[PDB]
Design a binder for this molecule. Structure first.
Ligand SMILES: [Zn+2]
Length: 347
DNA sequence: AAATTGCCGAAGACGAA
DNA sequence: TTCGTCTTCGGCAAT
């Protein structure tokens, strides 16, 4: 359904005036919070790392959701893995961060307490209001003029080599270059405070994800000229639209609550590994390329396996995170959608 | 000492052709 | 389509 998908992608185009209005409203709130945190001893070198779909140029229909990471430069860090989770770690030191130590580990909850307290106090004096202190890692979520959501995620920045659990991840050697993978792994990795049970930190590579999407092609000139337009980003947009429309259509149910845009985003990266060549993502074959993303995502649902693109042994669809009935329900609707030329693209 | 700020240009929306 | 013009974003050199 290439003709319908292009129509869907056209209605999904963000308004140029809306992003200008949205970004300015986010900028005023974000610059205010950053300026305040830089005045505290604990968050001396806090910096802005814009992540998420908007800054990956894959935002879906309106610039109403902004993912923002307040990164913190951390030196001499010792990682101890929590059980065999491969993605959750205890943070030790090999400084203003000693106030957040519980013995030898870096207490997350102590750092979120001060991070949230400073942010909640600042915006109490502001049309923005706090919320979403559940889920651990996105420390806080803001709502600007009850219109735009801003997920603020506290993060540590470690410039050391990536943890051993990422050794066989980021399999981009045949898609991007092996030099690119070497260069990307020289960039820092990020630690965000996530519950697993307490005082743990999860690995975060949203900066690598953002850099890959803005440099998606195997060819360097991909999506720079009319002869090399690909549909990678458009397939991710449609994949995000399928999940969002289904989550909205079944909002009254609880089955689709666990599935996030990161799952679709992660599954998209694996399809790019399976289809490394740009000729496998031509504009004319938008239906085939989107069906590839739909088919692979279904295999992840049916096999209960969606590897983290950077941590292979971290199953995003394991039974501990999502029950089989929720994955079976989403599998049902995706095939019904595909069998009927995706009715949710109209409602 | 270390954080700040401006500069430059690609990405992609928009209108026209 | 294709184009130009437009605005936003991100890196770092300037201190
Ligand atoms: Zn491309």
């Amino acid at each position: 359904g290439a003709s319908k998908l292009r129509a869907v992608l056209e209605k999904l185009k963000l308004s140029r005036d809306d992003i200008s209005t949205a970004a300015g409203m986010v900028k005023g709130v974000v610059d205010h919070l950053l300026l305040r945190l830089k005045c505290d001893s604990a968050f001396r070198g806090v910096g802005l790392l814009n992540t998420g779909s908007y800054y990956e140029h894959v935002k879906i229909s309106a610039p109403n959701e902004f993912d923002v990471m307040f990164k913190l430069e951390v030196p001499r860090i010792q990682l101890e893995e929590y059980s065999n989770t491969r993605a959750y770690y205890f943070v030790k030191f090999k400084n203003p961060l000693s106030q957040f130590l519980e013995g030898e580990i870096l207490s997350a909850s102590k750092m979120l307490s001060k991070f949230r307290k400073i942010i909640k106090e600042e915006i109490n004096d502001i049309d923005v209001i706090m919320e979403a202190e559940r889920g651990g890692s996105p420390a806080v979520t803001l709502l600007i003029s009850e219109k735009i959501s801003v997920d603020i995620t506290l993060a540590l920045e470690s410039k050391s080599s990536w943890p051993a659990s990422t050794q066989e991840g980021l399999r981009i050697q045949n898609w991007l270059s092996a030099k690119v993978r070497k260069q990307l792994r020289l960039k820092p990795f990020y630690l965000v405070p996530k519950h697993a049970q307490e005082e743990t930190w999860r690995l975060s590579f949203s900066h690598i994800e953002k850099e890959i999407l803005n440099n998606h092609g195997k060819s360097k000139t991909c999506c720079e000229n009319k002869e090399e337009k690909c549909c990678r980003k458009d397939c991710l947009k449609l994949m995000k639209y399928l999940l969002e429309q289904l989550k909205e259509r079944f909002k009254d149910k609880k089955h689709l609550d666990k599935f996030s845009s990161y799952h679709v985003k992660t599954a998209f990266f694996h399809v790019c590994t399976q289809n490394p060549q740009d000729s496998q993502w031509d504009r004319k074959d938008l239906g085939l390329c989107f069906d590839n993303c739909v088919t692979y995502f279904l295999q992840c649902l049916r096999t209960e396996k969606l590897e983290n693109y950077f941590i292979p042994e971290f199953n995003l669809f394991s039974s501990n995170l999502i029950d089989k009935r929720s994955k079976e329900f989403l599998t049902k609707q995706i095939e019904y959608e595909r069998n009927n030329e995706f009715p949710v693209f109209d409602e």
